[PDB]
């Protein structure tokens, strides 16, 4: 049974939030 | 330079001698198409006599690629 | 696969658009005085 | 002038291109940064560890998501022996139409890559069945990675910044890690296996929505609390059990059957559950050893101080070693990398012979890939362990604080250690190469009966003592009236002796003289790599050629052409030399693994037995013979699915060759060439309008050694990975 | 300290540490390293002599 | 190790037959009494004698029909394989100790001369021949020097790098 | 004659003579006793 | 000191170089960028049209090559823009002058790509 | 719990950890 | 710039100063050795790091020591 498009968009949004947190940690480690 | 010329002449004289003594040059002269030139014969020890291959002319030895046979025939 | 148009957008984005911006910004950063 | 290396003022004032390269290359050496304190160093390391954990969890989430979205996991679940698992989809606009059809492989998912990581077998074994389960796991792991990123950001805040004494609390960290990070996690994995994975192997569907009402055992937790624990070992899966179905399935959850599941050719899941339960109990017990804040437990300083032999053989013993280990992060990193790399090698040696995942032993490409991957990882990690030992000796070692203990005493007889390592390496190399060359000359002269074929009787004796009856030694597990035989006869010896006396698996393969010769080659590689690394670590502080080497640091180019010449005299250079020998050693190891298993998988065991005793046999019958399909991945007549591996094969050869340039040609040639080029740019009209900000210079000596080593290693790995995957895949 | 007397070098960074050399001369003007020692072996620079202080040489 | 004696191994006999057959196939292109014929006949005789000697020596053969050596001193002594590795081990160790002791004695003798480096590249051939002949009795002198403490230099007399 | 014998005592000439003797001894042993694999008679 | 040659020090060579838009006496840097972009962006479409992956398809070949040339022009305009922000931290050798030069390069390059497309269509 | 579990093994038929 | 240090084992033989290609070193008066002079390194901003001075030094171990440090235009030997 294949995934749905909404599931992929949900995963992309969660990964975008994770990327925002990654940028925050990278800035905090830099300075 | 004289020493180098002497060494080169020793090398050339050895090449002519091995053609005279340890070669199938006369048989190759009689049949230059089906006989492989050979002028090096190895001694039978530690199994190395397998290198004396069946080059033709009723002769066994290492096949040579220096072209001396063709040079000697041309001379 | 579901949302099969996504590779045709994301592969040019990750492969071309993101590295161009990344090298431009990093070049501007390492040349800053 | 510039501000990119903000952690190094000396690099920031460099007017050349060396500032960019060295700024990249020294970014994570936090101790050498400007105005760094110990506390801020530990806090930065803590946050970086959080970032690495987040990267790992995101990588696992990506693997899960791409398999769930573009793979064929349910189709592979239905037919695990006849379906190639899909890694991810291919979208390449440079592809031609035959490339599109070749990578489609007659399927409907478009161009795909066939996975070699073995994630399908692992995820199937642990109970995942559908794409929904993999997608949920990927979402959960992405959330976990975000949580670890936030935790890394949070503990850099001043309120949540841990103090230096918190980082140095060895007893509390050891107690907590042993009891919870190992023991409790192992207990929870036992819980997952008992509640989910074992029922899924028996055709029962257990997920979050019904696991609270599903009994893992029919009798419940009553046999556990009543102390009658043998109930959970009763009625195991029969030999006719089909994995993932209820046919032939038992009800046991914790067994000790041993051997393999007959259908999956893998370890029993109930054995795995009992293993992790016992591991959990042992590790939870081990985490109650060290004194924290409850008045009971051991102090590691007292343990180290007490262990000095009274005869004075070890001098002061281990006195002062607590402060040496605890204050030096490079000592801890070296110990951690040594143990982790040894464990990685153990993982490689145990997953091929005792495969833990269902239908993994039948996937030959996956087994070869996993072994080669983990052995090369272990080699790199061992090299790093010795490198950080050398860094500890240069940077952190205090001779006065370690007066007379085992560290100073092993420094005090380093010449004996290095010379004995040199002797054993020379002996192994001389005699292994001589035996191989003797056998090669015997095969060349047409007399293979004159070969020196030493039987490996010691390892065969070990195999006989573990139950292999083929060699005719009658002892222990191959002796039926022995105590060792009778003790395990009712517990695990039936399955173990079934598996070890079967030649259809990889459990304790039959060995002969070729195995002897290649094992001694492996010993030569290990001993020589150790000799280079150990000599680099022990001469890191100084030698007769450079008695003040500690004043110059771990990495420096040389000491100049004086005193005879001092090229590659630093301990970093010893690491750089040893990476070549490690690559050679792991190459020999993986060559042996792949060729012996290729002969076993093709049904022709005699090919390895009759050709591995001489090196021409290795070349012709392993490299030349098995590269025929790989190099025909694309030809004038067309292409097939192996064309990506042929291209990567050539790619790795090219990268390997490019590294030879950085390793053979050295700096001063290139600096003069770049000087002429810089003249040419300034004198060329229409191009002197533009100008450089950083003055172009040749790469530094150490940087060149690093770049050449990186190209060499990348070409080595890419070439062998392409050859291994193509040669195993094209026949199986 | 004497003339042509065997001495053992105690300087750890010296090439001839724990080795025996012959005293060439001892300077008497109060310089830092007055003892001149000749060795039968050359170091990595090809030098066969070095100067040592009083505490760096032990008579053997 | 599950091996069979080469005198009763079918692979050993098959290998002898195949090698003799290949040499005889090479033999039939030459006339009798010629030099290649005599050389090939001598090779055939050497092959037969070698296979007979390997069978008569008690060598063990694997499934490949090739002799396998036994190097454990226990299995070699109780099953008649000591001539494969153990006796060669004793012979090599004796000759190697001979060479090492002769070299050590020459170095020690040259150490006492006015130009010790001169004897290292211009060999004192009579002295080297005398010392070389005296290396037959090396184990007695070496074991005595080990017991006396004169074999080893003291650690205080050997240079080391700073630690 | 003293100078000539000193030249023959130099390390490469001595090495040539010694290795010629050793190689010849090994060759003639393998000629008189062909194919020695084990210490068996 | 500096070696002078007829290649470097001819009246004809210095005359030819002075008439180039990069060396003309008084020209605004935006206009120099405009001529340089027109000439270069006209030229780069040729290899893209005649040798690109769609070169054997009539009609699509010219469009694909001109789009590739426009993409190359955009990339080079970005490279010129980030060059000026670094090199400048002669009105051309200034930050604002190089900004105008980059804008003129982009405008001229797009114009040259469009003119090459028109010429191939006519 | 070691005593009760080892007793449960030695009382269950078919299992014998003894070396004789 | 590179760091050049002179240790008190210097015998004042002036060989390091004569070997220097960028005039980093000079001899100053001293009393710790027989030659009544010691080497000094007042101009280490011009030191390229060639270590010709260490090759010229006869003492064991070296009396002149060069420690390579931060690189400038002068220390990288750049004419451009
Ligand atoms: C380039 C010069 C050159 C080379 C490479 C060879 C090479 C060879 N020669 Mg030829 N020779 C050469 C020049 C000459 N050779 C000869 C006359 C001979 C003869 C008569 C023989 C060789 C033999 C050999 C072979 C074995 C030699 C040996 O084992 O020494 C042995 C090494 C020693 C140290 C002993 C030397 C004793 C000698 C009395 C002094 C070898 C292939 C043999 C042959 O070819 O195989 C059947 C052989 O019988 N050479 C003459 C005329 C004098 C030369 C000039
Ligand atoms: C993942 C990265 C990546 C992607 C998605 C592509 C995609 C493409 N490449 Mg490949 N490239 C990529 C990395 C690399 N490329 C190459 C080397 C080449 C070469 C040598 C060629 C390609 C060409 C192509 C095209 C082939 C399809 C076609 O038929 O064109 C049909 C094309 C069109 C119909 C017109 C396309 C116009 C294009 C979309 C304009 C793009 C403008 C930019 C996005 C502007 C960027 C501004 C900012 C963001 C920097 C396609 C656009 C071929 C070509 O077609 O392009 C010149 C070509 O000759 N690539 C290298 C060097 C190793 C890379 C690294
Ligand atoms: C006869 C009685 C007796 C024996 C046999 C031992 C035996 C030992 N005690 Mg002692 N003890 C004994 C009485 C008592 N001990 C102690 C108290 C202690 C303490 C407190 C300690 C010992 C330790 C030791 C060990 C090391 C001692 C030593 O000096 O190592 C000398 C070691 C060397 C000189 C180095 C040798 C290195 C070797 C040559 C390296 C070789 C490497 C290989 C070449 C490479 C690998 C090859 C491959 C094939 C493996 C050793 C096992 C120590 C220990 O290890 O505990 C476990 C220790 O801390 N004992 C008490 C009072 C309670 C005794 C009464
Ligand atoms: C958990 C493990 C671990 C940790 C925390 C560290 C931490 C550290 N290391 Mg150790 N290392 C570790 C494992 C290993 N180390 C080493 C060997 C070394 C050495 C020899 C040195 C360190 C140094 C350092 C420090 C500085 C790191 C740096 O600046 O990176 C900079 C990172 C780079 C410049 C990365 C570039 C190299 C990389 C291989 C590129 C790979 C690219 C691929 C070839 C591309 C392939 C795909 C292509 C084809 C598309 C830092 C304390 C240095 C030191 O402590 O200071 C004196 C130092 O000299 N490490 C190896 C063997 C490879 C390991 C495995
Ligand atoms: C095939 C390639 C190769 C070979 C044969 C060697 C050989 C050796 N390495 Mg070298 N290396 C090689 C590639 C590389 N290595 C290194 C880096 C190192 C390091 C850093 C070290 C070595 C050491 C060693 C020795 C290992 C001990 C041993 O095996 O003794 C057996 C010796 C051999 C196998 C050498 C060959 C012997 C020869 C066949 C004998 C016969 C000679 C002929 C009769 C002479 C004929 C002369 C002609 C003119 C008539 C050995 C001398 C280690 C060592 O020096 O200490 C023990 C050491 O520390 N290697 C790099 C990276 C730079 C390589 C690429
Ligand atoms: C590397 C060292 C080494 C190893 C791993 C072995 C291994 C073995 N030896 Mg051997 N040996 C070894 C060196 C030596 N051994 C011997 C003398 C013997 C004898 C006399 C015997 C063995 C026997 C054995 C076997 C059973 C030994 C045992 O512990 O039974 C528990 C086993 C195959 C036995 C046998 O031959 O096979 C069963 C036996 O009787 N060894 C000597 C001479 C002192 C050695 C040096
Ligand atoms: C007098 C001769 C002599 C003796 C007694 C030794 C003794 C030793 N060597 Mg040294 N060596 C000797 C000559 C030479 N060695 C070496 C190079 C080495 C290395 C690189 C190593 C040793 C090591 C060792 C030790 C271990 C045994 C071994 O590894 O053998 C191996 C010996 C060789 C590989 C060279 C042997 C060449 C030849 C057979 C010996 C020389 C013969 C003399 C020319 C004879 C002259 C006598 C005449 C004039 C009467 C042992 C202390 C190892 C170590 O230190 O162990 C702790 C080690 O790693 N040797 C060279 C340069 C090739 C030599 C010439
Ligand atoms: C120095 C090493 C050396 C030793 C110990 C011997 C030993 C021997 N050779 Mg030999 N040879 C040796 C080098 C050489 N030989 C020969 C050529 C011969 C010949 C032609 C003969 C011997 C014969 C003999 C034997 C009687 C003399 C004896 C076994 C004779 C023989 O084989 O038995 C009587 C004999 O006829 N040698 C050459 C030239 C290639 C050598 C170099
Ligand atoms: C360390 C590696 C090594 C070892 C252990 C051997 C061992 C052996 N080789 Mg092999 N070889 C080795 C490396 C190499 N071999 C060869 C090429 C050959 C050949 C071509 C032959 C051998 C043969 C032999 C045997 C010689 C026995 C003998 O002459 O007794 C004589 C004993 C003495 C001289 C002792 C001294 C007594 C004293 C004079 C009184 C023996 C089994 C021969 C054999 O027939 O195969 C089994 C053979 O024909 N070797 C090459 C290439 C050059 C090598 C590298
Ligand atoms: C330099 C240095 C360093 C480093 C080091 C290293 C890197 C090392 C490594 C090491 C290693 C890498 C090791 C390993 C080892 C191992 C072992 C030691 C093992 C053992 C084992 C055993 C004991 C077992 C036994 C058994 C059993 C139990 C069962 C049966 C079988 C057998 C018998 C096998 C450090 C940091 C410290 C410090 C500084 C200096």
PDB file of C-alpha atoms in Angstrom, chain D residues 10 13-16 18 545-548 551-552 557-563 667 671 674-675 678 682 692 695-697, chain J residues 7 49-52 54-57 59-62 65-80:
ATOM      1  CA  UNK D  10      46.729  33.799  13.112  1.00  0.00           C
ATOM      2  CA  UNK D  13      45.647  37.495   9.064  1.00  0.00           C
ATOM      3  CA  UNK D  14      46.945  34.995   6.491  1.00  0.00           C
ATOM      4  CA  UNK D  15      46.798  36.847   3.138  1.00  0.00           C
ATOM      5  CA  UNK D  16      46.851  33.651   1.048  1.00  0.00           C
ATOM      6  CA  UNK D  18      45.980  28.832   3.000  1.00  0.00           C
ATOM      7  CA  UNK D 545      66.547  12.931  15.517  1.00  0.00           C
ATOM      8  CA  UNK D 546      64.160  15.430  17.158  1.00  0.00           C
ATOM      9  CA  UNK D 547      64.432  15.427  20.968  1.00  0.00           C
ATOM     10  CA  UNK D 548      62.117  18.457  21.341  1.00  0.00           C
ATOM     11  CA  UNK D 551      57.392  21.613  21.433  1.00  0.00           C
ATOM     12  CA  UNK D 552      56.266  21.491  17.785  1.00  0.00           C
ATOM     13  CA  UNK D 557      55.578  19.403   8.046  1.00  0.00           C
ATOM     14  CA  UNK D 558      59.178  18.567   8.988  1.00  0.00           C
ATOM     15  CA  UNK D 559      62.195  20.051  10.739  1.00  0.00           C
ATOM     16  CA  UNK D 560      63.973  21.008   7.513  1.00  0.00           C
ATOM     17  CA  UNK D 561      66.745  19.364   5.492  1.00  0.00           C
ATOM     18  CA  UNK D 562      69.266  19.626   8.329  1.00  0.00           C
ATOM     19  CA  UNK D 563      70.503  16.690  10.418  1.00  0.00           C
ATOM     20  CA  UNK D 667      55.240  21.629  -2.838  1.00  0.00           C
ATOM     21  CA  UNK D 671      54.603  27.102  -5.804  1.00  0.00           C
ATOM     22  CA  UNK D 674      51.692  29.192  -9.380  1.00  0.00           C
ATOM     23  CA  UNK D 675      54.164  32.097  -9.289  1.00  0.00           C
ATOM     24  CA  UNK D 678      50.197  34.814 -10.982  1.00  0.00           C
ATOM     25  CA  UNK D 682      48.590  40.410 -13.870  1.00  0.00           C
ATOM     26  CA  UNK D 692      42.271  37.839  -6.219  1.00  0.00           C
ATOM     27  CA  UNK D 695      47.056  35.367  -2.820  1.00  0.00           C
ATOM     28  CA  UNK D 696      47.153  31.999  -4.641  1.00  0.00           C
ATOM     29  CA  UNK D 697      49.729  29.685  -3.073  1.00  0.00           C
TER      30      UNK D 697
ATOM     31  CA  UNK J   7      69.272  28.934  23.794  1.00  0.00           C
ATOM     32  CA  UNK J  49      61.251  29.589   8.025  1.00  0.00           C
ATOM     33  CA  UNK J  50      63.871  27.968   5.780  1.00  0.00           C
ATOM     34  CA  UNK J  51      65.770  26.607   8.838  1.00  0.00           C
ATOM     35  CA  UNK J  52      69.149  27.230   7.215  1.00  0.00           C
ATOM     36  CA  UNK J  54      69.397  25.165  12.263  1.00  0.00           C
ATOM     37  CA  UNK J  55      71.314  23.368   9.510  1.00  0.00           C
ATOM     38  CA  UNK J  56      74.304  25.614  10.249  1.00  0.00           C
ATOM     39  CA  UNK J  57      74.213  25.173  14.042  1.00  0.00           C
ATOM     40  CA  UNK J  59      75.676  22.452  18.997  1.00  0.00           C
ATOM     41  CA  UNK J  60      73.855  19.268  20.167  1.00  0.00           C
ATOM     42  CA  UNK J  61      71.040  19.867  20.492  1.00  0.00           C
ATOM     43  CA  UNK J  62      70.486  23.078  18.431  1.00  0.00           C
ATOM     44  CA  UNK J  65      65.368  26.990  17.042  1.00  0.00           C
ATOM     45  CA  UNK J  66      62.724  28.088  14.546  1.00  0.00           C
ATOM     46  CA  UNK J  67      59.067  27.486  15.387  1.00  0.00           C
ATOM     47  CA  UNK J  68      56.791  28.015  12.397  1.00  0.00           C
ATOM     48  CA  UNK J  69      53.842  30.219  13.316  1.00  0.00           C
ATOM     49  CA  UNK J  70      51.264  32.383  11.595  1.00  0.00           C
ATOM     50  CA  UNK J  71      51.972  32.998   7.920  1.00  0.00           C
ATOM     51  CA  UNK J  72      52.262  36.481   6.414  1.00  0.00           C
ATOM     52  CA  UNK J  73      53.374  37.704   2.990  1.00  0.00           C
ATOM     53  CA  UNK J  74      57.006  37.893   4.127  1.00  0.00           C
ATOM     54  CA  UNK J  75      56.992  34.481   5.817  1.00  0.00           C
ATOM     55  CA  UNK J  76      55.404  32.808   2.776  1.00  0.00           C
ATOM     56  CA  UNK J  77      58.128  34.290   0.550  1.00  0.00           C
ATOM     57  CA  UNK J  78      55.679  35.861  -1.892  1.00  0.00           C
ATOM     58  CA  UNK J  79      56.813  38.300  -4.570  1.00  0.00           C
ATOM     59  CA  UNK J  80      53.202  38.912  -5.652  1.00  0.00           C
TER      60      UNK J  80
END
